[PDB]
A = this chain, B = another copy of it.
Amino acid sequence: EVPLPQLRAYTVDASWLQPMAPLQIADHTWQIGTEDLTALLVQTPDGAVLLDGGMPQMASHLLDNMKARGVTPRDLRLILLSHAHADHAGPVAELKRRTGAKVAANAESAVLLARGGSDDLHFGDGITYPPANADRIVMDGEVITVGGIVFTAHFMAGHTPGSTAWTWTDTRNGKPVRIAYADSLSAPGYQLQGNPRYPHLIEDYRRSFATVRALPCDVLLTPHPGASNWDYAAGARAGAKALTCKAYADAAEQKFDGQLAKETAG
């Protein structure tokens, strides 16, 4: 009669998979992912840090861009994550096998990473990737220091329980630049109200909007560059139109309120 359906691959817009050369954000901070997925390399005298890696198939491209920047596999010391979905943490397991890197994450992100995104609160097993283990668990507001660049974790639960903003201070034209890599604030297809798998979902998003609004934030970056109005293909003007953290949080809250109203009506 009728067989069960074939497994469906997690397919994405081509621009999410379009390689780009490294794009400099500040003196030691570079975008090294694809046109439409952020993966940030921060280079110190004491090794390099990667914040996100994008999709599972991006590992070799990331390593090629690291090499172009002078970062060998032994020089990658630390991987940090915005959240542990397949389009941001996809290549983490492979990167750990191929480099010196260790992963630091909060408990919620660590648990999701260790199950490869399976049993997701909203997606089930629809979007999985190779599992990886965290080497260090961080708490809210904890700092991690690499070569005198201090990264601070700001938990902003909602998009996932373990969603995190990472902040650090780099320099540009001699002057300090407070960089905020704020996680996604979307809720794509989520049941927001009365969700048995996430009962306090709405309260957590509301707190997260407030957290993002208050981040130290001369420059905002986001896992999907379009969410913060970055255009990584625009060269010297890639960041010209970027939102402030305040504007990003307000836009996300307006969208969220509209989604709540539509859910009540549906």
- Docked Cα-Cα span, A8 to B141, in Å, equals 33
The answer, yes or no, to whether A108 is at the interface (CB within 8 Å) is: yes
A176 CB within 8 Å of chain B: no
* A97: B residues at CB distance < 8 A: 119, 135-136
Asked whether any CB of chain B lies closer than 8 Å to the CB of A58, the reply is yes
Considering the complex, give the chain B residue whose CB is closest to the CB of A141: B199
A197 to B170, CA, bound (A): 24
In contact, B4 and A58 (Cβ under 8 angstroms): yes
Complex Cα gap A257–B81 (Å): 36
Q: Which residues of B contact A136 (CB under 8 A)?
A: 97
**7 residue pairs bridging A and B, Cβ less than 8 Å apart:** A3-B34, A97-B119, A100-B100, A108-B108, A116-B128, A139-B161, A139-B198
Instruction: Give a binary string over A93-104; 1 marks a CB under 8 Å from any B CB, 0 the rest.
Output: 110110010100
Interface of A is mostly: loop
Taking A4-B57, A139-B200, A142-B196 as known contacts, 4 extra A-B pairs with beta carbons closer than 8 A to each other, sorted by chain A number, are: A5-B57, A56-B125, A128-B128, A139-B197
Contacts of A243 in B (CB 8 A): none
In contact, B4 and A61 (Cβ under 8 angstroms): yes
A265 on interface, CB distance cutoff 8 Å: no
- Assess whether A111 is in contact with B107, with CB atoms less than 8 Å apart: yes
Taking beta carbons and an 8 Å cutoff, which residues of A are in contact with B? 1, 3-12, 14-15, 17-19, 34, 46-47, 55-58, 61, 74, 77, 93-94, 96-97, 100, 102, 107-108, 110-111, 114-116, 118-119, 121, 125, 128-131, 133, 135-137, 139-143, 161-162, 196-200
Task: Evaluate whether A46 and B18 lie within 8 angstroms (CB atoms) in the complex, with A61-B4, A125-B130 already known.
Answer: no
The reply to whether A142 and B199 form a contact with Cβ atoms under 8 Å apart is yes
A261 to B74, CA, bound (A): 40
Q: Which residue of B lies closest to A1 (CB)?
A: B18
Task: Find A130's partner among B118, B139, B200 (CB 8 Å cutoff).
Answer: B118
Residues of B within 8 A of A10 (CB): 7
Q: Contacts A9-B8, A136-B97, A196-B143; is A119 near B111 (CB within 8 Å)?
A: no
Contact A139 B199 (CB under 8 A): yes
Q: Which residues of B contact A34 (CB under 8 A)?
A: 3-4
Q: Is the CB of B199 within 8 A of A162?
A: no
* A139: min CB distance to chain B, Å: 5
Q: Return chain B residues, CB-CB under 8 Å to A77.
A: 74, 100
**A135 to B94 Cα, complex, angstroms:** 11
CB distance from A107 to the nearest CB of B (A): 4
Establish whether residues A7 and B5, one from each chain, have CB atoms under 8 Å apart when the complex forms.
Answer: no
